């Protein structure tokens, strides 16, 4: 919630990277369920979260 309010209304897809990083810092890595959870929380398409997961090398998809 604190992360989401850092960006203007109508542009909260700008929080995919830090929310995914929080998912990784809690779980340890990113199972596909975490990607789907982030997509649900930000109402972005899951494929958009998949792209960010597979593009940035700091995301542990294993």
């Amino acid at each position: 919630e604190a992360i989401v309010k850092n960006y203007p209304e109508g542009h909260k897809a700008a929080a995919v990277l830090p929310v995914l990083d929080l998912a990784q810092r809690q779980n340890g890595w990113l199972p596909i369920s975490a990607m789907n959870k982030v997509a649900e929380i930000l109402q972005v398409p899951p494929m958009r979260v998949y792209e960010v997961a597979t593009f940035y090398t700091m995301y542990n998809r294993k």
């Binding site: 850092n6 960006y7 203007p8 542009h11 897809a13 700008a14 929080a15 995919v16 990277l17 830090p18 995914l20 990083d21 930000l42 972005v44 958009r48 792209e51 960010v52 593009f55 940035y56 090398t57 700091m58 995301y59």
Partner: protein, 432 residues
């Protein structure tokens, strides 16, 4: 009257006085070191005066390209059409050899915060977005501690410094991409997409992050500004030569007795830097093989060129290289230069975002070719092909990563073709 040897900067005229973190980096220490001094007056002088002093200083981009800062920041002087305006400080620091931004964000973070305030006021921006690389977790946390103190002291936020200006500073960590140092790729990484750069004819000053007018600036460019506005602008211009003005942070790494980060007056001879600050190359200056002057994108120069070169944009452009980020990576004569340049090309292959055909396919192609060049498994008629392929990537990509991959190859082919052909002939002799 005029200077002819631009070196031996004193401690008094050094901007980043807490460069080694030997003094307090928090607000109390930063204030005693001159920070956040009369910032209300600097803001009240107005954006026009701040931009005028940034132009007077002749300051250029400290994150590579080196575009003049005052002119770039003035693209935001236009009136508002309803959309917000943002300052986006670039703290990605992905360039190999470069670790200068890392040193400000953790040992002088209040410099960065107050530079954000002064610049954003100059561009008339409501908030600053500092995009730091995700690998700098401790530096990002130090920066956010500094931001918290600036907020609690009333220097940022509502009625910032007593000027009536409302300014916010948000830190947004990266997630492991070097392409996210590129300004528009950084913008789109802030917006929660893949870090792919945008086509430029829509400029960030019109359509930037969230589609709003933005200026993307390097950490050092932003951080020097409060000292630029508070010290005179003419004072900054009295350092270095014309055009390329001021002082710069230098990262000396590689085959050096004392690899270090130092602040030296601009237009300093590379020799003076390497010997006085870095302690010289191991084995002495006779043992010098190349030196890469401005980070991995800038092509190497040989010892002959590096013998009497000056460290500024124009002097290094004369030497068929660039100043880049002022990250000098020196190599002694015990170095496989083909292996080093192949390693750099491999880095660029690993960092290509894959969006556009020339970078995506050609940098991979050049990595494949350069890997062979280390073994000698090639014919000498492939060197000219490598040159032509690099020129096919250069000037044909969306962003400058293709250019910064093609340039190390060209700088290797330009000064070390005999070594490449010697390796190829040795391989031909071993494998009949």
């Amino acid at each position: 009257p005029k200077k002819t040897s631009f070196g031996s900067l004193k401690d008094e005229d050094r901007i980043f006085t807490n460069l080694y973190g030997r003094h307090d980096w928090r607000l109390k220490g930063a204030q005693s070191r001159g920070d956040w001094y009369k910032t209300k007056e600097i803001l009240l002088k107005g954006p026009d005066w701040i931009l005028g002093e940034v132009k007077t200083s002749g300051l250029r981009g400290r994150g590579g390209a080196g575009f003049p800062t005052g002119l770039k920041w003035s693209f935001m002087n236009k009136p508002s059409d309803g959309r917000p305006k943002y300052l986006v400080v670039n703290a990605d620091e992905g360039e190999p050899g470069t670790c200068k931004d890392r040193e400000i964000i953790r040992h002088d973070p209040h410099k960065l915060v107050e530079g954000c305030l002064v610049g954003g006021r100059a561009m008339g921006a409501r908030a600053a977005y500092i995009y730091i690389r995700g690998e700098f977790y401790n530096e990002a946390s130090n920066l956010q501690v500094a931001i918290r103190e600036a907020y609690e002291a009333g220097l940022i936020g509502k009625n910032a410094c007593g000027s009536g200006y409302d300014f916010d500073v948000f830190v947004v960590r990266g997630a492991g991409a070097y392409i996210c140092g590129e300004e528009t790729a950084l913008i789109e990484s802030i917006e929660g997409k893949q870090g792919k750069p945008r086509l430029k004819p829509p400029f960030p000053a019109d359509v930037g992050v969230f589609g709003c007018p933005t200026t993307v600036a390097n950490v050092e460019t932003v951080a020097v500004s409060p000292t630029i506005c508070r010290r005179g602008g003419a004072w900054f211009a009295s350092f270095g030569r014309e055009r390329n003005s001021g002082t710069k942070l230098f990262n000396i790494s590689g085959h050096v007795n004392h690899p270090c980060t130092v602040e030296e007056e601009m237009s300093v001879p590379l020799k003076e830097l390497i010997e006085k600050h870095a302690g010289g190359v191991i084995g002495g200056w006779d043992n010098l093989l190349a030196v890469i002057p401005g980070g991995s994108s800038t092509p190497l120069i040989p010892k002959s060129v590096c013998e009497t070169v000056l460290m500024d944009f124009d002097a290094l452009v004369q030497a068929q290289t660039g100043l880049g980020t002022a990250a000098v990576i020196v190599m002694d004569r015990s170095t496989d230069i083909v292996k080093a340049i192949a390693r750099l090309i491999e880095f660029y292959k690993h960092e290509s975002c894959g969006q556009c055909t020339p970078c995506r396919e050609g940098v991979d192609w050049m990595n494949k070719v350069m890997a062979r060049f280390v073994k000698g498994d090639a014919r000498p008629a492939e060197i000219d092909s490598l040159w032509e392929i690099s020129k096919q990537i250069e000037g044909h990509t969306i962003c400058a990563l293709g250019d910064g991959a093609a340039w190390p190859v060209q700088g290797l082919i330009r000064h070390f073709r005999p070594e490449l052909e010697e390796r190829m002939q040795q391989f031909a002799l071993q494998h009949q």
